[PDB]
Structure formats: structure tokens, C-alpha cells
Ligand binder design. Structure first.
Ligand SMILES: NC(=O)c1ccc[n+]([C@@H]2O[C@H](COP(=O)([O-])OP(=O)(O)OC[C@H]3O[C@@H](n4cnc5c(N)ncnc54)[C@H](OP(=O)(O)O)[C@@H]3O)[C@@H](O)[C@H]2O)c1
Ligand SMILES: NC(=O)c1ccc[n+]([C@@H]2O[C@H](COP(=O)([O-])OP(=O)(O)OC[C@H]3O[C@@H](n4cnc5c(N)ncnc54)[C@H](OP(=O)(O)O)[C@@H]3O)[C@@H](O)[C@H]2O)c1
Ligand SMILES: O=C(C[C@]1(c2ccccc2)[C@H]2C[C@H]3C[C@@H]1C[C@@H](C2)[C@@H]3O)N1CC(O)C1
Ligand SMILES: O=C(C[C@]1(c2ccccc2)[C@H]2C[C@H]3C[C@@H]1C[C@@H](C2)[C@@H]3O)N1CC(O)C1
Lengths: 278, 263
């Protein structure tokens, strides 16, 4: 280790992913006790990364940590708690960073439990979706930024197609995913002009075969689900490659139409217009 | 094709109507002969708006003062405003929390307040107004921004709240369509407008062509009266050319087929 030195990221490292890119990297994965979160932890362990996983369930998190170590994780730990608690969110990052001796990648993936329903008067679900799905991500980012700045790290935000286009029956959920795009895309512009070398990856996912999603859509929505294992790897790759956005869905139509080149053109036109050095 | 007669005798709520775009909407509405209920925190500024409204031609004009930080006030305001007019035809959601241009560092208080005032209060107001809007086959008009469609630095919290409006209101618009709820939803995407607040906030950060507030206010009302899904208003021809997202509309249409709505 003391007699070793160099870099994994040279020519082509912005285009071609290699699992060696995550070897020895210090990664946090939230909502990692099941679904996409757990699959990402598993891929990270296999690549030789140090991982800290979180979710509310201590028992489920223990099993993820055990399997991570079996897979070849440089180190694997968990810290259990609710992302409804902003104090837990803030303290969780401080512990996790101490546990690894820094932080290279922050993977923000948890959501509050959501079922498909027409919106009528559930303001409690609207507020909780905004607190858990959005506000806790901002709190985690603030807590992690000093460590990510020291490592020229990465923030990976797990979003949805419902965070880019309108879908009925997910109004609160969709509001919170759209809010993530607005917030993280704005700070990405700020980091660029402020020369903060921390990348931000927004992951736009279609239906994924997680137990929660398959149960929730049953008899309501009839869509093709994509495999969770492949989903989880594509999220990691986008993060490691420092891509601004990752798109992952079963439909070839989606991948063909989801990009918004006019938004990118407008942002470039507006990019000069302001005097931000004030 | 819009005609000012479309608003004659209509029962309209305008929030954040003590100044800027909101006050100019109250004026175009009063001119057209509508019944209006204006709101903001400042009692003294609201009184002046109510007086000038009556002079311009309003069927009736009232104000109810209070903060949209208070969800109880938001909910009760709509019921009181509805009682004053004996119903509701149009709900114009326009207020924002005071915001200045700044890089984001650790102001979680501003992030939460922007989400509460700019977004959550609009959802609370919509829930309170929906029974009356259903009776009249009314309209909801949501005032958003270009910063609610594309990324801008120095407005992270504000932008998050405007994006949230698009996500929420575009989703319920799909639900109303399939549920046969005849209440239209208009999302207004505005560029820089020559309001005193914006001209002060941008000073020395931007020298753009400030679109006139009077014309802005009318275009918002027209979009609402015409039941348009989205209204775009900016000084730049390039903005109007690039702001639309036809691919999002195509994707939404393709995904609609996956739903079992007979449940
Ligand atoms: N599955 C899909 O079809 C799909 C599609 C698009 C986007 N996504 C996005 O992908 C992400 C993962 O979704 P998923 O389907 O993998 O979900 P999942 O299997 O239901 O997992 C949710 C995770 O978050 C945790 N969680 C729940 N409530 C929490 C709370 N209050 N505080 C902290 N953690 C909490 C859960 O464990 P605990 O209950 O023990 O805390 C679990 O670890 C979400 O951001 C979702 O929007 C998924
Ligand atoms: N001006 C622009 O360039 C521009 C561009 C794009 C979008 N927009 C959107 O257009 C709308 C109007 O903007 P504007 O420039 O006309 O703003 P403005 O002149 O500053 O007016 C804001 C209004 O909201 C009220 N308000 C503020 N805080 C409130 C609170 N806590 N509770 C209740 N009401 C509150 C204010 O009155 P009190 O202070 O007396 O409460 C005032 O009537 C906003 O939704 C804004 O995002 C404006
Ligand atoms: O975001 C998701 C997945 C979910 C969904 C499922 C159908 C329709 C909208 C949302 C699943 C069901 C609810 C809402 C949301 C998040 C999870 C899983 C939650 O349990 N999609 C699929 C679409 O392509 C974007
Ligand atoms: O949303 C607005 C107007 C505002 C703004 C001003 C420059 C840049 C971003 C935001 C004005 C200054 C702040 C933030 C926000 C809302 C008001 C007026 C607030 O006082 N724009 C103009 C741009 O095209 C989209």
C-alpha cells in the first residue's frame, strides 16, 4: 500500500467502465436493505469497495453486510435508522465517514413506502414524500460534501421516469422526484462555476422487478419490469463514470425519447448570461 | 381565441396579489368584471389592490391577509373566500417565499420553507378549492418559472419547489382526465419579469430584457380561461423555441396504455 501508487482513471475512463474503478472506494448506499439498494451493495462488495449501508431494519441490514463481506468487500458496515429524522440523516454520514476514513461516493436511494392511488386529500403522504424522498437527500448531501470535496467524490441520486414525465396515481411521489432534478441539477451548475470537483448523477429508472414495485403495480399498472441486478450495476457505472444522467428502462422507445436536448441547449444559452462571481 | 368577456362575473382567487405579477392579474381580472379575492401577508398593500380593483370594474373585491407558511390559514382562506363569492371558478396560485440569488451551502431552513410556501401550500389550497371548482367546472392556474423546467444556479431550493409543482400538478391533470373531473390545470412557465422584487434581486447578477408584468399577468389569465395545459412567457424567441418538450408528451401517451383505470 505504501509502496503502491497511481490512478485507475486515465484515457477512456469517462467512456469505459471497469470494476477496478470501485476497488478500495468508500461508498454509502441508503435504502440498501432490499431492492435496488441491496443489489448495488452486492456489486460494490464484488468490486472491492468499502461500504456503509443504511435503512430502518437492523436485521435485514445485518444480512446485507454479511453477504457483502462474503463477496469480497474491503469493509462492510451498517447504521440503522429513519430518514424521516433529519438528525439521524446528518449524524449517519459523520459516523459512516469515520468508519471508512473518508467518502468517495454517496448513493441516495431510499423513499418512503408508496402505493398507487389517485390524489384526493392525503397531505400527510405529500409532506412525508417531500421529507423522506427529497429533504433527507439534501441533508445527507450537506453532511457528506466536506468528505466528497477532499476525495473529488460523487453523489448518485436515484430518481424515476416519474421524475421526468407525468404519471397518474403517483402525484406526491412524482413531486418529490421532480424536486430532486430541480435541486441537484441546480447545485451541479453551482459546483461547475465554483470549481467544486464533486460529480452529481441523476438516475432515471423505469419499472424494476423489486418485490415492492411488483406488489404495488399488481392489477393497476401493466408494464414490463427490468431486472434489479442490471439496474443496480448501471447506476454504479454512471456514478463511477461521473455521468450527469443515467437512463434505465425495459423499453427501447423510452431510451430513444427520454433525453431532453432542448433543456441542455437552453442551459448553455443561459450559462453565460449571469454574473455569478459576486 | 380569448375574449375578456370569458372572465366577466367569474369568481377568482389570486394569491400573492399585493404586488408584482399577482397584483397585475388582479387588475386585468377587475377590468374584465370578475369577482376577486386577493391574498398576501400585507393588509395595507392588499387594501390598495382591492380599492384600485373596484375602480377598474370588478363585480366584487375582497382581501384576506395571512401567511402561506400556515397550512391552516391556507385551508381556511379558500373556504372564507368561497363564502364571500358564493363559489369559485378560478384558483390562481402565484405566491412564493422571499428568495434572493445565492449559492447553496447549508441553508436547510430556506429549502424547507421554499417547499412549504411555494409547493405544499399550493397542494393545500387545491384540496380546499376542488369541491367548488368541480361544481363550476373551474380552473387551477399554477404560476411556475423557466427555473421549474431547466436548471439554474443560485436558486436550488426555489427551482426544487417549481419542479415539484410540475410533477404534482401534471400528475393530477392525468388523473382528472381519466376520472372525468372537468377542472383544468394551467402551468405557467415564466422568464424574467420586470417586477420590483425580481429587478432588485437580479441587480448586478443579470441585465436581461425584463418582460412587462402587465402583459405577463394577462397571458397567465388567458391560458387559464382557454384551459391550456401550459403557458410560456419570456422575452427570448429562442426560449419559446426550446422550452417545449414534445418527447415528454409522446412518452406520457405511450405510458397511458399501461393503466387499468376502471378500478
Ligand atoms: N422499483 C422500481 O420500479 C423503481 C422505479 C423507479 C425508481 N425507483 C427508485 O429506486 C429506489 C429504490 O426503490 P426500490 O424499488 O428498490 O425500493 P424497496 O425495495 O422498497 O426499498 C426501499 C428501501 O428504503 C428503505 N426505507 C423505507 N422507508 C425508509 C425510511 N423512512 N427511512 C429510511 N429508509 C427507508 C427500505 O428499508 P426499511 O423499510 O427497513 O427502512 C429499503 O431499504 C427509490 O428511490 C425508488 O424511487 C424504483
Ligand atoms: N418576477 C419574475 O421575474 C418571475 C419569473 C419567473 C416566475 N415568477 C413567478 O411569478 C410569481 C410572482 O412573482 P413576482 O415577481 O410577482 O413576486 P413578488 O412581486 O415578490 O410578489 C410575491 C407575492 O407573494 C406574497 N407572499 C410572500 N411571502 C408570502 C407568504 N409567506 N405567504 C403569503 N404570501 C406571501 C407577497 O406579499 P407579502 O410579502 O405582502 O406577503 C407578494 O404579494 C411567483 O410564483 C414567481 O416564482 C416570477
Ligand atoms: O417510479 C416508478 C416505480 C413505482 C411506480 C410504478 C408504476 C407507476 C408509477 C410509479 C413503483 C410503485 C410505487 C411508485 C413508484 C416507486 C415505487 C415502485 C413505489 O412502490 N416507476 C415505474 C415508472 O416507469 C416509474
Ligand atoms: O424564476 C425566475 C425569477 C427569479 C430568478 C431570477 C434570476 C434567475 C433565476 C430566478 C427572480 C429572483 C428570485 C428567484 C426567482 C423568483 C423571484 C424573482 C425571486 O425574487 N426566473 C427568471 C429566470 O428566467 C427564471
Amino acid at each position: 500500500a505504501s509502496m503502491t501508487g497511481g490512478q485507475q482513471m486515465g484515457r477512456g475512463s469517462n467512456e469505459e467502465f471497469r470494476p477496478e474503478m470501485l476497488q478500495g472506494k468508500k461508498v454509502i448506499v441508503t435504502g440498501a436493505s432490499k431492492g435496488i439498494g441491496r443489489e448495488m451493495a452486492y456489486h460494490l462488495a464484488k468490486m472491492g469497495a468499502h461500504v456503509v449501508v443504511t435503512a430502518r431494519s437492523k436485521e435485514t441490514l445485518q444480512k446485507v453486510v454479511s453477504h457483502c463481506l462474503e463477496l469480497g468487500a474491503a469493509s462492510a458496515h451498517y447504521i440503522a435508522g429513519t430518514m424521516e429524522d433529519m438528525t439521524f440523516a446528518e449524524q449517519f454520514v459523520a459516523q459512516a465517514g469515520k468508519l471508512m476514513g473518508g467518502l468517495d461516493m454517496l448513493i441516495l436511494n431510499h423513499i418512503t413506502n408508496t402505493s398507487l392511488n389517485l390524489f384526493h386529500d392525503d397531505i400527510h403522504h405529500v409532506r412525508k414524500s417531500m421529507e423522506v424522498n427529497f429533504l433527507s437527500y439534501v441533508v445527507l448531501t450537506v453532511a457528506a460534501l466536506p468528505m466528497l470535496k477532499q476525495s473529488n467524490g460523487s453523489i448518485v441520486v436515484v430518481s424515476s421516469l416519474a421524475g421526468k414525465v407525468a404519471y397518474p396515481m403517483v402525484a406526491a411521489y412524482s413531486a418529490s422526484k421532480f424536486a430532486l432534478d430541480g435541486f441537484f441539477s441546480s447545485i451541479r451548475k453551482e459546483y461547475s462555476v465554483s470549481r467544486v470537483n464533486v460529480s452529481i448523477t441523476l438516475c432515471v429508472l423505469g419499472l424494476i422487478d423489486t418485490e415492492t414495485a411488483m406488489k404495488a403495480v399488481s392489477g393497476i399498472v401493466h408494464m414490463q419490469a427490468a431486472p434489479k441486478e442490471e439496474c443496480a450495476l448501471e447506476i454504479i457505472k454512471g456514478g463511477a463514470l461521473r455521468q450527469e444522467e443515467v437512463y434505465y428502462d425495459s423499453s427501447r422507445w423510452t431510451t430513444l425519447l427520454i433525453r431532453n436536448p432542448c433543456r441542455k441547449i437552453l442551459e448553455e444559452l443561459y450559462s453565460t448570461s449571469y454574473n455569478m462571481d459576486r
